[PDB]
Design a protein around this ligand. Structure first.
Ligand SMILES: *[C@@H]1O[C@H](CO)[C@@H](O[C@@H]2O[C@H](CO)[C@@H](O[C@@H]3O[C@H](CO)[C@@H](O)[C@H](O[C@H]4O[C@H](CO)[C@@H](O)[C@H](O)[C@@H]4O)[C@@H]3O)[C@H](O)[C@H]2NC(C)=O)[C@H](O)[C@H]1NC(C)=O
Ligand SMILES: *[C@@H]1O[C@H](CO)[C@@H](O[C@@H]2O[C@H](CO)[C@@H](O[C@@H]3O[C@H](CO)[C@@H](O)[C@H](O[C@H]4O[C@H](CO)[C@@H](O)[C@H](O)[C@@H]4O)[C@@H]3O)[C@H](O)[C@H]2NC(C)=O)[C@H](O)[C@H]1NC(C)=O
Ligand SMILES: *[C@@H]1O[C@H](CO)[C@@H](O[C@@H]2O[C@H](CO)[C@@H](O[C@@H]3O[C@H](CO)[C@@H](O)[C@H](O)[C@@H]3O)[C@H](O)[C@H]2NC(C)=O)[C@H](O)[C@H]1NC(C)=O
Ligand SMILES: *[C@@H]1O[C@H](CO)[C@@H](O[C@@H]2O[C@H](CO)[C@@H](O)[C@H](O)[C@H]2NC(C)=O)[C@H](O)[C@H]1NC(C)=O
Ligand code: NAG
Ligand code: NAG
Ligand code: H9T
Ligand code: H9T
Lengths: 392, 390
């Protein structure tokens, strides 16, 4: 989408995975979807270093709205949970230096069962712009047919444009298409700044594995269509929650950087370990995700329960990820000729290799003819940056 | 098995899950199945507080053997990786106040393809006894018949007894039988100090859940047979490795306590987080696992992606575990009548409840009328101790 937005993958926080559709403010006030949750999360995005690291969009997912539209046919904030309305939350969020995302559905109802945007693309798009919304995520539940799904996604895209406000547009068009027919990505790219391809993530190694396996399986179809203004969306970061080991957390962060994924944390910024915070705020790994060249990486090799991924970076640099998919035993040694990495370009005639994950370690100069030797923890990833050089 | 051993579930360290069958001492001398690995673990079991916490058996799994028996038809330690031999390793482990475990197979080969004990049960038993071995784990690969399986486990049990040496006998009889016919646990216990029920554990939450699900499904058959001298073995603790979140590690520690499981760590004691070390050394949770009554706990309830397990303890105490099996979202609220716990007896007329995991908190006095409310992390467990007011 050529709206001048998302020249790098969008970074921020989205409530869905950690907070879901919790409407019980009486019995579960610390986890219910309320203005207070977003206000508190906004404050901590400033004070705990998240905005400084690049996490800029504070995004509301499903279950923000009243059960019915107002007299004038517009969506309304839930009066109990959002008594001060979207406009005032937008002012609060803007006052902190952050931008506000909101959610809607192409179909007749949102996935949670709240009012769909069909019949109202133009008014809803205009409502969001009045409110001060800077991003829209647009789910695809309760939609008849390819024709509607396609038409709806295309309509809301144009509708948001006609508001002449800068609104990042986040689509689930490809994901709700697979059931009927293979998606067309050059079409989707025209209309959307990013697009969900695969089933919603949850707090599990299994879900991370299933997102990577779908991505590598499908990579010829999706890798080249990604670039500034249009990104593949492999769903939220779930680092800082409950289900992932340290190594599985490193694997998500490493590979979301390799895939030029948008980085939407879904966690509780009020209760996050120092180790999880440091990983999500890792300047060097965020810098790989946010590389201005904006070329998506890919799986180079697989076998013997190992995976090798790489991503081309500006200035003849490459990121390399080595995953150990063996879920038993100890760290396994993997060796590769540096000539095989970065299409033989990265280390011609030499590169300087820095390990970024699981720890940051200068490894030094490798000749084009060198072997790189690593040890990789089970379900973990070693992430390396290769800098092309002639200083050797 | 009435040999006076395993009066509480056996505690120690076993190489298999973490170190596996690594024979490459050339390229990986730090990881390979060697005498040096077992000596390093022994030193750290003393120096880092493992023995003081009750971890006492330092156990060798598969891949310690030379490829072929000796001229006198006995098992040998691999001459390069175990150059001083098992007896000398036993001597060293004993000098540190620890016990040594070793491994053999009931069939023609071990699972990793070294000498089996079929035909050699009596020699093997006497060899192990002579070497000063304090424990035998007896795997079941390369056994052609159920007849041979039963006969072998029984035979080795009787041959160990005849040596005169106190040797903890860890069996895999039920696991290898289960595909073909329902094991007779009453018979198995007569011959075994503990018995493997289920597939080898991995460094994964999937492995944990599948072991808990198998145990709760078969609980009618296995819970009542467990007791001093004979335990269900749900396999090794993998806490301190790579594959488990903190909350999944707490779940393993809590439920292994509830199930009165042997506690065999398979980790690197040279490289373990402070967190992992304090969980595995948790005095109050080990005291539940080690309760002298020796009554295995069971699943009380399952529903709404929650499980409640309980174990009756000494002196009118109960342990209660509450698992959140929902792997999406945040800490989920669970409430239960305390009158539904410990068969109606735990909190009649009242109980003091202490949370032990994920952290120690006194929750206070609960009346027989009361409800316990808890927030449980996804894939996490809340472990409580109930003390009847009397
Ligand atoms: C509604 O849709 C229209 C039609 O797509 C859309 O207009 C397009 O917007 C983009 C982004 O503003 C315009 O592209 C710019 O072109 C100008 C002049 O040629 C450049 O200055 C801009 O350069 C930026 O990016 C460069 C690198 O790519 C940087 O070098 C530079 O520093 C700038 O930051 C940019 O390329 C494009 O011209 C229009 N196209 C048309 C047909 O008008 C409009 O933005 C949409 N509006 C909303 C609010 O959605
Ligand atoms: C070989 O097989 C035989 C047949 O089972 C096996 O004999 C059994 O040995 C145990 C263990 O010694 C006997 O039970 C014990 O008897 C001793 C000696 O009198 C007691 O001290 C033991 O009491 C302990 O537990 C008490 C708790 O109530 C403590 O208060 C006390 O301090 C002790 O620690 C216990 O009663 C068992 O009775 C025999 N059975 C028979 C049939 O003889 C033998 O041990 C096996 N030998 C080997 C080498 O495996
Ligand atoms: C370890 O290996 C040996 C040798 O391969 C196994 O011994 C063999 O076991 C089979 C039983 O499965 C015997 O074959 C039987 O022959 C009778 C005829 O007498 C036939 O009716 C049966 O149906 C069957 O074919 C075979 O005789 C026997 N060989 C020897 C030398 O004893 C042994 O069973 C293996 N042990 C284990 C525990 O797997
Ligand atoms: C995928 O969709 C794109 C965009 O709709 C298609 O590309 C355009 O198709 C129209 C006619 O339908 C032509 O006017 C343009 O020449 C095409 N390319 C553009 C605008 O870049 C494309 O046909 C579709 N791809 C496939 C394989 O069906
Ligand atoms: C919404 O419902 C109406 C009424 O049945 C129906 O005509 C329409 O096809 C539905 N629209 C979508 C986009 O699902
Ligand atoms: C199970 O084994 C015990 C001990 O060998 C025996 O007394 C009992 O009769 C057996 N029961 C069945 C159902 O086979
Ligand atoms: C769409 N199952 C829904 C959720 C909202 O109800 C959430 O936004 C998911 O990410 C999306 O796929
Ligand atoms: C038996 N797969 C084998 C292993 C040894 O080769 C190990 O001991 C397992 O724990 C056991 O079940």
């Amino acid at each position: 989408l050529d709206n001048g937005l998302a020249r790098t993958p969008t970074m921020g926080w989205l409530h869905w995975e950690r907070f879901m559709c919790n409407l019980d403010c009486q019995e579960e006030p610390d986890s219910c979807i309320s203005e207070k949750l977003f206000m508190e999360m906004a404050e901590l995005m400033v004070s705990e270093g998240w905005k400084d690291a690049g996490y800029e969009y504070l995004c509301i997912d499903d279950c923000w709205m009243a059960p019915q539209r107002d007299s004038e046919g517009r969506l309304q904030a839930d009066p109990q949970r959002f008594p001060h309305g979207i406009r005032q939350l937008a002012n609060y969020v803007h006052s902190k230096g952050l931008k506000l995302g909101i959610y809607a559905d192409v179909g007749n109802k949102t996935c949670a069962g709240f009012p769909g945007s069909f019949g109202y693309y133009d008014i809803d798009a205009q409502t969001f712009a009045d409110w001060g919304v800077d991003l829209l995520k647009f789910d695809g539940c309760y939609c008849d047919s390819l024709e509607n799904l396609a038409d709806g996604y295309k309509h809301m895209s144009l509708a948001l444009n006609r508001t002449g406000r800068s609104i990042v547009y986040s689509c689930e068009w490809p994901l709700y298409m697979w059931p009927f027919q293979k998606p067309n990505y050059t079409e989707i790219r025209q209309y959307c700044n990013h697009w969900r391809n695969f089933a919603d993530i949850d707090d599990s190694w299994k879900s991370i594995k299933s997102i990577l396996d779908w991505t590598s399986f499908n990579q010829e179809r999706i890798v080249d269509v990604a670039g500034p203004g249009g990104w593949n969306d492999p769903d939220m970061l779930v680092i800082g929650n409950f289900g992932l080991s340290w190594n599985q957390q490193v694997t998500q962060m490493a590979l979301w950087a390799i895939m030029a994924a948008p980085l939407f944390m879904s966690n509780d910024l009020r209760h996050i370990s120092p180790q999880a915070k440091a990983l999500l705020q890792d300047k060097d790994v965020i810098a790989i995700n946010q590389d201005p060249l904006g070329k998506q990486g890919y799986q180079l090799r697989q076998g013997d329960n190992f995976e090798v991924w790489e991503r081309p970076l500006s200035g003849l640099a490459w990121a390399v990820a080595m995953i150990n998919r063996q879920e038993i035993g100890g760290p396994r040694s993997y060796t590769i000729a540096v000539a095989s990495l970065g299409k033989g370009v990265a280390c011609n005639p030499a590169c300087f290799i820095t390990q970024l994950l699981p720890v940051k370690r200068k490894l030094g100069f490798y000749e084009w003819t060198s072997r790189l030797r690593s040890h990789i923890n089970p379900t973990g990833t070693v992430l390396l940056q290769l800098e092309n050089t002639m200083q050797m």
